């Protein structure tokens, strides 16, 4: 939303402008430090690891104890 604020303020020629190139680079790297699909990957692996023998444990409806 800030980026669209920036370009609406600075026109569409915006990174060509002296500062826009900088803020572009910074927002891009900041965005790259936010692509969280790895968290879902590794966490889905841990979930799958648990899913191997836990998620459907109705195999003993009234399990002994």
């Amino acid at each position: 939303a800030y980026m669209k604020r920036v370009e609406d303020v600075l026109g569409k020629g915006w990174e060509n402008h002296v500062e826009g190139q900088k803020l572009k680079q910074d927002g891009d790297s900041f965005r790259m430090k936010l692509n969280t699909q790895e968290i879902f990957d590794d966490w889905a692996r841990k979930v799958q690891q648990r899913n191997l023998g836990v998620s459907g444990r109705i195999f003993t409806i009234e399990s002994t104890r």
Partner: protein, 76 residues
């Protein structure tokens, strides 16, 4: 060029006379008021007046009154 955007010229064209030969400019100068009719010190002689806006932009006419290669020009 704008002083903001510099990755591409804002407005740009060449400078050729009636013939398609180059105009090796050297120290041009706009006159007083920026009437876009800047004078251009060419390489040697053929000093020109050149416009910027309109289809007639660029080289207007050649006046030669010296043969040594030009080094500068100024207006007042």
């Amino acid at each position: 060029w704008s002083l903001d955007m510099l990755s591409h010229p804002q407005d740009s064209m060449e400078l050729v006379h009636k013939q398609s030969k180059a105009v090796a400019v050297t120290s041009m100068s706009f006159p007083v008021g920026d009437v876009n009719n800047f004078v251009v010190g060419s390489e040697e002689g053929s000093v020109y007046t050149a416009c910027r806006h309109g289809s007639k932009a660029g080289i207007s006419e050649m006046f030669e009154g010296h043969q040594g290669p030009i080094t500068g020009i100024h207006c007042h």
